[PDB]
Design an enzyme around this catalytic site. Structure first.
Site, PDB file in Angstrom:
ATOM      1  N   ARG A 107     -37.907 -17.270-143.107  1.00  0.00           N
ATOM      2  CA  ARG A 107     -37.519 -16.767-141.789  1.00  0.00           C
ATOM      3  C   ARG A 107     -36.505 -15.607-141.967  1.00  0.00           C
ATOM      4  O   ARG A 107     -35.968 -15.401-143.048  1.00  0.00           O
ATOM      5  CB  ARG A 107     -36.889 -17.906-140.948  1.00  0.00           C
ATOM      6  CG  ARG A 107     -37.882 -18.822-140.246  1.00  0.00           C
ATOM      7  CD  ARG A 107     -37.345 -19.454-138.954  1.00  0.00           C
ATOM      8  NE  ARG A 107     -36.869 -18.450-138.012  1.00  0.00           N
ATOM      9  CZ  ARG A 107     -35.978 -18.632-137.032  1.00  0.00           C
ATOM     10  NH1 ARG A 107     -35.467 -19.838-136.745  1.00  0.00           N
ATOM     11  NH2 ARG A 107     -35.589 -17.578-136.315  1.00  0.00           N
ATOM     12  N   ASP A 153     -32.958 -24.390-139.241  1.00  0.00           N
ATOM     13  CA  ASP A 153     -31.689 -23.670-139.477  1.00  0.00           C
ATOM     14  C   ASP A 153     -30.783 -24.562-140.315  1.00  0.00           C
ATOM     15  O   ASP A 153     -30.181 -24.134-141.303  1.00  0.00           O
ATOM     16  CB  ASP A 153     -30.941 -23.369-138.145  1.00  0.00           C
ATOM     17  CG  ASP A 153     -31.734 -22.544-137.152  1.00  0.00           C
ATOM     18  OD1 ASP A 153     -32.806 -21.982-137.472  1.00  0.00           O
ATOM     19  OD2 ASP A 153     -31.270 -22.489-136.000  1.00  0.00           O
ATOM     20  N   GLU A 173     -26.344 -11.930-131.406  1.00  0.00           N
ATOM     21  CA  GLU A 173     -26.835 -11.224-132.582  1.00  0.00           C
ATOM     22  C   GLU A 173     -27.061  -9.804-132.121  1.00  0.00           C
ATOM     23  O   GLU A 173     -27.808  -9.575-131.169  1.00  0.00           O
ATOM     24  CB  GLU A 173     -28.135 -11.829-133.089  1.00  0.00           C
ATOM     25  CG  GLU A 173     -27.996 -13.267-133.577  1.00  0.00           C
ATOM     26  CD  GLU A 173     -29.327 -14.005-133.609  1.00  0.00           C
ATOM     27  OE1 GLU A 173     -30.107 -13.860-132.654  1.00  0.00           O
ATOM     28  OE2 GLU A 173     -29.581 -14.709-134.591  1.00  0.00           O
ATOM     29  N   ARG A 197     -28.732  -9.960-128.222  1.00  0.00           N
ATOM     30  CA  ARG A 197     -29.256 -11.158-127.583  1.00  0.00           C
ATOM     31  C   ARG A 197     -28.219 -11.725-126.645  1.00  0.00           C
ATOM     32  O   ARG A 197     -27.018 -11.642-126.906  1.00  0.00           O
ATOM     33  CB  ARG A 197     -29.582 -12.169-128.664  1.00  0.00           C
ATOM     34  CG  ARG A 197     -30.094 -13.524-128.218  1.00  0.00           C
ATOM     35  CD  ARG A 197     -30.391 -14.323-129.460  1.00  0.00           C
ATOM     36  NE  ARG A 197     -30.852 -15.678-129.197  1.00  0.00           N
ATOM     37  CZ  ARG A 197     -31.161 -16.557-130.150  1.00  0.00           C
ATOM     38  NH1 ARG A 197     -31.081 -16.227-131.440  1.00  0.00           N
ATOM     39  NH2 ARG A 197     -31.554 -17.785-129.811  1.00  0.00           N
ATOM     40  N   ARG A 219     -41.412 -17.003-127.498  1.00  0.00           N
ATOM     41  CA  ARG A 219     -41.197 -15.886-128.406  1.00  0.00           C
ATOM     42  C   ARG A 219     -42.564 -15.293-128.728  1.00  0.00           C
ATOM     43  O   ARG A 219     -43.231 -15.706-129.677  1.00  0.00           O
ATOM     44  CB  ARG A 219     -40.436 -16.321-129.640  1.00  0.00           C
ATOM     45  CG  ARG A 219     -39.004 -16.679-129.320  1.00  0.00           C
ATOM     46  CD  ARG A 219     -38.222 -16.980-130.570  1.00  0.00           C
ATOM     47  NE  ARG A 219     -36.793 -17.045-130.335  1.00  0.00           N
ATOM     48  CZ  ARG A 219     -35.898 -17.526-131.197  1.00  0.00           C
ATOM     49  NH1 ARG A 219     -36.258 -18.013-132.406  1.00  0.00           N
ATOM     50  NH2 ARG A 219     -34.608 -17.512-130.854  1.00  0.00           N
ATOM     51  N   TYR A 271     -38.008 -13.275-134.657  1.00  0.00           N
ATOM     52  CA  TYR A 271     -37.054 -12.323-135.257  1.00  0.00           C
ATOM     53  C   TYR A 271     -37.817 -11.216-135.936  1.00  0.00           C
ATOM     54  O   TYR A 271     -38.935 -11.441-136.443  1.00  0.00           O
ATOM     55  CB  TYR A 271     -36.115 -12.977-136.288  1.00  0.00           C
ATOM     56  CG  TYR A 271     -34.968 -13.837-135.769  1.00  0.00           C
ATOM     57  CD1 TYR A 271     -35.098 -14.627-134.623  1.00  0.00           C
ATOM     58  CD2 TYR A 271     -33.752 -13.910-136.471  1.00  0.00           C
ATOM     59  CE1 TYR A 271     -34.053 -15.440-134.189  1.00  0.00           C
ATOM     60  CE2 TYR A 271     -32.712 -14.729-136.045  1.00  0.00           C
ATOM     61  CZ  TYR A 271     -32.860 -15.507-134.914  1.00  0.00           C
ATOM     62  OH  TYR A 271     -31.829 -16.354-134.487  1.00  0.00           O
TER      63      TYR A 271
END
Ligand SMILES: CC(=O)N[C@@H]1[C@@H](O)[C@@H](F)[C@](F)(C(=O)O)O[C@H]1[C@H](O)[C@H](O)CO
Ligand SMILES: *[C@]1(C(=O)O)O[C@@H]([C@H](O)[C@H](O)CO)[C@H](NC(C)=O)[C@@H](O)[C@H]1F
Length: 659
Positions: A208, A233, A502, A518, A580, A613
């Site tokens: 990622r 994460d 971010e 963001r 997303r 992302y």
């Protein structure tokens, strides 16, 4: 091994083609492999590449097919009406739709193996799923199969799931072909857009958080999270892997682990994707996460990343302690010796560990890579491996001795369980790197470090100030150096709400920079500085992006060449309230008053395809390089997928669309 049927160049527009005479009763054992090289003329609707069925009245739940959805999911069904067995096996984000306005050729496959009771699916060189099912059906298990077709499934005399596109080549085999054969058979031009792949030289099955940067000498450089225990994460093990190209992104080096701990071995793990099971995490290895790159004026390259001690979750970890003490006006990283309640130690000059109660050096020291020595000799701990025996997760000491490290759970001396930022430097453009340096406690002694905004940093042209984007959860934190990166400061800017801010920067004109970020409100925000980042305006918002409240990271860069006679910025982001997805690249032209005219955009694939992302760079030939998460990395349905972070390129003319 030769097909029972092979057909070429079958163009279809929903109606299908009957191939019953050329397949009837050829599946002798009942096992099958079907390999389909296709492209879609339209992505809309549920579409079957082929269908083998009982077409008679009442037998509409007796079929096998491989299907495509409008979001890039590849799946298969195998169903039998009388036994009421209904198997569906699939993975999201397995295929590509379009690329630069043209349908993409994919090669997919299904393998049904009766001995193993597994269905396997392949897309563009990747085995996207293999699943064992209790109610396994082969072709012989489904009663009264009488209709075999291309581009559809015949159900009660009607064509269901009509395919729109061309079957460039389709092969049916009456056996289960081996994995390596089918991987090779499905390898194509799409396969070559993966820089990082599952179980490559990183050892990771998952990735990622890609980052692209083009250096002054023409080298195109990438970094990424190598996430070993699925795409979680936290808790996880994550390393920062890198790869580079010296031919404008055509070929890339074998990835290297650049920021990595070794408390846990970097190994390929089959993370479960079922409901419930997919929430599984490891107990946590020491982690690097969320990389940021910048090249200094003198051509030295910096890479920053977040550092998290093993087992420490970003949600729980302490916000009220930096992990440092101040002693005689110096900032020293503090340590707690196992068995103590207080942090009685500090790492001082030459890595010597001092007892702060006595203010005297101990027998212990810490080297520049965080390793602990006693009387000049390394202390060691045993490395962990993770495995699936069976199918239970096991973690265990694996026989490898590694240096004891202050970030490890087995360390005699341990840092505060909070997040840090580290950076490393390279003087040969990414081939070798220095030891890491932890940022001092720039947020203050009684606050945790900020979290980096993945992407790049910038050098502002008028002052030469270096700027590194970061955030705290309630504020923006613009990290900067005014001495060519010898020392670091921060500007902390309170935000309207608790945004995961971010950010990435662009320079509009000398001294004038904007931070795009963001938010938690559905929109992309931008803040403006007219003094090279010393002071910042209130937020403004892009009018044309509408996302869900959680938001996604973005990428925005300056472009070196004029577009319609104007300086340009290039933005990459998802744009959809539904997830997303609907990735877009936007061209913004800088007006004389430093507002931006958002004049062009290009949809990266079809709108329901995944896009999370991303990262942009200008290639040395002035084309645009893009690497992105081609999946919804927020969705709980799209966790732990292999080979879903591709790299593609655009000429500006590919991007100058829509207005
Ligand atoms: C692949 C898939 O999702 N197949 C399912 C079947 O497993 C079953 F659920 C069914 F009801 C049916 O048609 O038999 O619906 C379809 C499908 O959702 C629909 O046709 C909407 O296009
Ligand atoms: C992105 C993500 O949303 O997909 O989230 C970052 C943060 O968790 C963010 O604050 C959530 O809103 C992750 N970073 C960290 C440090 O957790 C990213 O890696 C990524 F996961």
């Amino acid at each position: 091994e030769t097909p029972v049927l092979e057909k070429n160049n079958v163009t279809l527009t929903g109606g299908g083609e009957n191939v019953t005479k050329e397949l009837k009763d050829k599946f002798t054992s009942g096992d099958f492999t079907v390999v389909i090289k296709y492209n879609q003329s339209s992505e809309k609707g549920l579409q079957a590449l082929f269908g083998i069925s009982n077409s008679k009245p009442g037998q509409q739940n007796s079929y096998v097919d491989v299907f495509l959805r409008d979001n890039g999911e590849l799946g298969m069904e195998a169903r039998d009406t009388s036994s009421n067995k209904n198997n569906l096996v699939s993975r999201p984000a397995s295929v590509w739709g379009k690329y630069k306005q043209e349908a993409v050729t994919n090669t997919v496959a299904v393998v049904a193996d009766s001995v193993k009771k597994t269905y396997s699916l392949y897309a563009n060189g990747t085995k996207v799923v293999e699943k064992k099912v209790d109610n396994f059906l082969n072709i012989k298990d489904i009663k009264g199969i009488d209709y075999y077709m291309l581009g559809g499934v015949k159900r009660a005399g009607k064509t269901a799931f009509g395919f729109n596109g061309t079957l460039e080549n389709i092969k049916f085999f009456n056996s289960a072909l081996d994995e390596e054969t089918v991987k090779k058979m499905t390898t194509n031009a799409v396969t070559g857009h993966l820089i990082y792949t599952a179980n490559d030289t990183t050892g990771s099955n998952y990735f990622r958080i890609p980052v692209l940067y083009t250096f002054s000498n023409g080298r195109v450089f990438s970094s990424i999270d190598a996430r070993y225990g699925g795409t979680h994460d936290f808790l996880n093990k994550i390393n920062i892997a890198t790869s580079y190209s010296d031919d404008n992104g055509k070929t890339w080096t074998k990835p290297k682990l650049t920021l990595a701990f070794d408390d846990f071995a970097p190994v390929p793990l089959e993370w479960p994707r079922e409901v419930g099971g997919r929430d599984l995490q490891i107990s946590g290895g020491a982690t690097y996460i969320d990389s940021v790159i910048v090249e200094k004026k003198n051509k030295q390259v910096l890479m920053f990343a977040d550092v998290m001690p093993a087992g420490v979750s970003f949600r729980e970890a302490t916000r009220k302690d930096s992990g440092y003490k101040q002693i005689d006006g110096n900032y020293y990283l503090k340590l707690r010796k196992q068995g103590d309640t207080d942090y009685n130690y500090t790492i001082r000059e030459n890595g010597t560990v001092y007892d702060d109660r006595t203010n005297r050096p101990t027998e212990f020291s810490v080297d520049k890579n965080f390793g602990i020595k006693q009387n000049g000799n390394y202390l060691t701990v045993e490395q962990y491996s993770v495995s699936f025996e069976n199918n239970k997760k096991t973690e265990y000491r694996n026989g490898t001795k590694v240096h004891m490290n202050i970030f490890y759970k087995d360390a005699l001396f341990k840092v505060v369980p909070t997040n840090y930022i580290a950076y490393i430097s390279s003087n040969d453009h990414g081939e070798s790197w220095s030891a890491p340096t932890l940022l001092p406690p720039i947020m203050g002694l009684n606050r945790n470090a900020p979290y980096l905004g993945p992407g790049r940093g910038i050098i502002e042209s008028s002052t030469g100030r270096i700027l590194i984007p970061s955030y705290t959860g309630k504020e923006s934190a613009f990290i900067y150096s005014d001495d060519n990166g010898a020392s670091w400061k921060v500007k902390v800017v309170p935000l309207p709400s608790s945004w995961s801010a971010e950010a990435q920067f662009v320079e509009l004109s000398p001294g004038v920079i904007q931070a795009y970020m963001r938010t938690n409100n559905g929109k992309i925000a931008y803040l403006t500085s007219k003094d090279a980042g010393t002071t910042w305006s209130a937020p403004e918002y892009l009018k044309f992006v509408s996302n869900p409240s959680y938001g996604t990271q973005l990428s925005i860069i300056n472009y070196s060449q004029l577009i319609d006679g104007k300086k340009a910025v290039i933005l990459s982001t998802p744009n959809s309230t539904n997830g997303r997805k609907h990735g877009q690249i936007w061209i913004g032209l800088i007006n004389d008053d430093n507002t931006i005219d958002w004049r062009y955009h290009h949809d990266v694939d079809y709108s329901n395809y995944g896009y999370s992302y991303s990262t942009l760079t200008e290639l040395p030939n002035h084309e645009i390089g893009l690497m992105f998460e081609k999946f919804d990395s927020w969705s709980r349905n799209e966790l732990h997928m292999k080979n879903v972070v591709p790299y593609i390129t655009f000429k500006i003319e590919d991007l100058k669309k829509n207005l």
